[PDB]
Ligand binder design. Structure first.
Ligand SMILES: Cc1ccc(/C=N\O)cc1C(=O)N[C@H](C)c1cccc2ccccc12
Ligand SMILES: [Cl-]
Ligand SMILES: [Cl-]
Ligand SMILES: [Cl-]
Ligand SMILES: [Zn+2]
Ligand SMILES: [Zn+2]
Ligand SMILES: [Zn+2]
Ligand SMILES: [Zn+2]
Length: 313
């Protein structure tokens, strides 16, 4: 028998000594086995594998519990989807642009670069240790793992056309936004006045307008009575808000927002860029950087800082 030694893991924290037969495939002995993203199930051990760390699909209770504790999912496809993504994201370039980890354009990743840039500018704690650890590494310039995890958590494959607002919504659902509270008042001439409290993701995301100020003053929405009613923001408790609308020409003013998603072209197959408010306006286009004191262009998301807001109405 001819047998190198390896470590198996689901989380790359808890490592298990295995001694593998070199005649038999990884698949025969562990089930689905991966190396640095690369599916090696049907391959047999090369000598240069000695003492390396393979990811395996959980196949005992120990590994299922470890996988849930690390990823916060029992989805048996999760590991394979994560590894398939990582196989690409480890080949992407992550240049520092204006002090932020960006992504050089590849594999339709403009939406992922825009999300990654945004996440470095808002306050968020991820529930899954996998996401938290990778977010810290990405902020320090090593974003491959974080990008692979984002794809796996959003049910996206490399090359798939992604929406930044949907991606942020999925990420927010994996974050601690419990303290986040939104109180709305709705005013109809007929049904009258109704207040509702939103919590978590629904407290920090709105679709319909880019302007936080315009949200505070009120926006026109349909009432169930059939009339148009006024929805306005009573109370906001969150470290940020995300205001989205279908793309449209919008003016961004230095110092009045944190950052924004620019989107150019047709539904689904357009291109995102990222606008950030520093000492002036920076436009991050993957590896490309431009700056200007003023900006007008097609915006679909705007992010703003918050802590505690109460209306004067
Ligand atoms: C880029 C993208 C990827 C996937 C999806 C939805 N399903 O797969 C959608 C978009 C999208 O076009 N989002 C932009 C920001 C968008 C969002 C909302 C309305 C839009 C109307 C016209 C053009 C673009 C519009
Ligand atoms: Cl493990
Ligand atoms: Cl969970
Ligand atoms: Cl979670
Ligand atoms: Zn273990
Ligand atoms: Zn969780
Ligand atoms: Zn690729
Ligand atoms: Zn009504």
């Amino acid at each position: 028998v001819r047998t190198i030694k390896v470590f198996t893991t689901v989380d790359n924290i808890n490592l298990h000594t295995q001694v593998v037969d070199m005649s038999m495939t990884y698949g025969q002995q562990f089930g689905p086995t991966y190396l640095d993203g690369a599916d090696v199930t049907k391959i047999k051990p090369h000598n240069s594998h000695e003492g390396k760390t393979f990811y395996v699909l959980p196949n005992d209770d120990t590994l299922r519990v470890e996988a849930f504790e690390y990823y916060h999912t029992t989805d048996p496809s999760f590991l394979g989807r994560y590894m398939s993504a990582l196989n690409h994201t480890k080949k992407w370039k992550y240049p520092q642009v204006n002090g932020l980890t960006s992504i050089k354009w590849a594999d339709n990743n403009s939406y992922l670069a825009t999300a990654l840039l945004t996440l470095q500018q808002i306050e968020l704690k991820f529930n899954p240790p996998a996401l938290q650890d990778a977010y810290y590494r990405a902020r320090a310039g090593e974003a491959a793992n974080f990008c692979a995890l984002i794809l796996a958590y959003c049910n996206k494959t490399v090359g798939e056309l992604g929406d930044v607002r949907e991606t942020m919504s999925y990420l927010f659902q994996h974050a601690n936004l419990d303290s986040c509270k939104r109180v709305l008042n709705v005013v109809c001439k007929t049904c009258g006045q109704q207040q509702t409290t939103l919590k978590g993701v629904e407290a920090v995301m709105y679709m319909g307008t880019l302007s936080y100020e315009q949200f505070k003053k009120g926006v026109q929405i349909p009432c169930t009575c059939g009339k148009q009613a006024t929805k306005y923001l009573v109370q906001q408790e969150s470290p940020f808000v995300m205001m989205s609308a279908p793309p449209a020409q919008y003016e961004l003013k230095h110092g009045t927002f944190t950052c924004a998603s620019e989107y150019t072209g047709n539904y689904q197959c357009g291109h995102y860029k990222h606008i950030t408010s520093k000492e002036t306006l920076y436009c991050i286009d993957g590896a490309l950087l431009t700056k200007s004191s003023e900006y007008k262009g097609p915006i679909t998301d705007v992010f703003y800082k918050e802590n505690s807001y109460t209306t004067t109405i």
